[PDB]
């Protein structure tokens, strides 16, 4: 189907096929040399150049080398620079260039490639969509939103554009607006629409508006393998980890950590209160659109397994106490933070991103009534000097209807069934 050979390349199709044949047989090593020989002999051959690139691409896979993949990325560029490049080959080469640029985290570089691809093929809808993903990956939702608006003005039925537009709308707290786009988008069945993200956020948007159809979409996302279960909807998981909403200290195995938190809870409280009184700016409002209403702020000591040096100068004793417990300080998919919530606060039902952590809550200042947390089908209360443990990858919900502030200390730990090597290798969240 795809025509990759220009006039001259057709005259050397035998040599080109011979070299490509070696690459398919996994003998990538002598295929590199075969294509490099063709590139020397025919320095303007787009197909020979593409072969060199693909081989460099496979060699990067084998050797796991960023440097050679960087080379492949340049060779894919080289293909586009040669004269008389067939349209199919030009598109393929630059698409792969972008893909690999994103893999390396050269998201800015990827963007320029995607912009070029759209400039070269102004009627290709899929490339406009890919450009939209490029903007999303760098955090540029404004430019992403424009791209999908542009796509949808020409192609209103494009499901990919709809789910992504819906995703952006929901991120912007345009809940009601987002639902039909997410729904129609997933329902389109277009490639790239069957993604856990869109099931996750469609049901959540529906929950927030009181649409009881929400769990029907959670059930479907589960059925399609996006969620471990209807209750546990995290999307960055290690499959198989013991899954339950509430944990006892003994069940976690982190009994020494719990002992330390509970024995020393007042020093932790006191440093938190001191920061509230003398440096309240260190508490940052919750910024993930999880509140229906009210005031909720957090003062973070560790995130992604990295100590915040300045923050720990505000709670030096607490940070010193925690240094002894790598199960939390080294939890690169969790945090250590104070969490203050005031009356008139309701946190929407929500889910954390990963099943690889468990979340400890130490009560520091807990009004006698008004404060509670639901995880799955069970609601519990905090106690001063006492640790609660739950898996926040399960849907949970929080209320604060007391007559004064509620302060807790949040300590995330690796899921105990995670091996030392998994703890070492899992990318940070």
């Amino acid at each position: 189907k795809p025509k990759l050979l220009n006039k001259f390349d057709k005259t050397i199709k035998a040599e080109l096929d011979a070299a490509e044949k070696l690459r398919k047989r996994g003998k990538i090593e002598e295929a590199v040399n075969a294509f490099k020989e063709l590139v020397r002999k025919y320095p303007q051959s787009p197909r020979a150049r593409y072969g060199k690139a693909q081989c460099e691409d496979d060699l990067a896979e084998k050797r796991r080398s960023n440097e050679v993949l960087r080379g492949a990325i340049e060779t894919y560029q080289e293909v586009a620079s040669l004269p008389d490049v067939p349209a199919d080959l030009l598109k393929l080469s630059l698409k792969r260039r972008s893909d690999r640029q994103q893999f390396l985290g050269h998201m800015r570089g990827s963007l320029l490639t995607l912009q070029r691809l759209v400039q070269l093929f102004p009627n290709d809808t899929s490339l406009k969509n890919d450009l939209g993903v490029g903007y999303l990956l760098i955090g540029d939702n404004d430019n992403a939103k424009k791209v999908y608006e542009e796509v949808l003005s020409v192609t209103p039925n494009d499901g990919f554009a709809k789910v992504h537009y819906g995703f952006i709308l929901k991120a912007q707290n345009k809940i009601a607006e987002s639902i039909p786009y997410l729904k129609e988008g997933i329902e389109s069945g277009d490639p790239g629409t069957d993604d856990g993200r869109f099931y996750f956020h469609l049901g959540d948007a529906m929950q927030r508006v009181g649409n009881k159809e929400a769990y029907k979409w959670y059930e479907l996302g589960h059925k399609r393998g996006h969620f471990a279960s209807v209750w546990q909807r995290s999307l960055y998981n290690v499959n198989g980890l013991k899954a339950q909403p509430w944990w006892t200290p003994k069940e976690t195995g982190y009994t020494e950590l719990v002992k330390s938190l509970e024995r020393n809870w007042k020093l932790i409280r006191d440093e938190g209160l001191a920061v509230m009184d003398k440096a309240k700016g260190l508490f940052l409002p919750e910024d993930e659109n999880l509140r229906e209403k009210g005031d909720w702020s957090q003062f973070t000591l560790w995130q992604q397994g990295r100590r915040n040096e300045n923050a720990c100068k505000g709670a030096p004793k607490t940070c010193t106490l925690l240094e002894k417990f790598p199960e939390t300080t080294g939890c690169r998919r969790g945090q250590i933070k104070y969490s203050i919530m005031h009356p008139g606060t309701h946190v929407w039902p929500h889910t954390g991103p990963t099943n690889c952590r468990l979340r400890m809550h130490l009560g520091l200042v807990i009004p006698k009534e008004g404060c509670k947390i639901r995880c799955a089908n069970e609601t519990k209360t905090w106690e001063e000097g006492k640790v609660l443990i739950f898996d926040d990858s399960f849907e949970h919900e929080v209320w604060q209807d007391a007559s004064s502030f509620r302060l807790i200390f949040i300590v995330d730990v690796w899921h105990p069934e995670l091996t030392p090597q998994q703890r070492r290798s899992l990318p940070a969240i």
Binding site: L104, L136, G139, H201, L290, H350, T351, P353, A428
Partner: peptide
Amino acid sequence: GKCKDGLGEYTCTSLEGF
């Protein structure tokens, strides 16, 4: 932009290279 308590971001991880 990080995923701390939720899944608000398009991607929650950020990898660079092999």
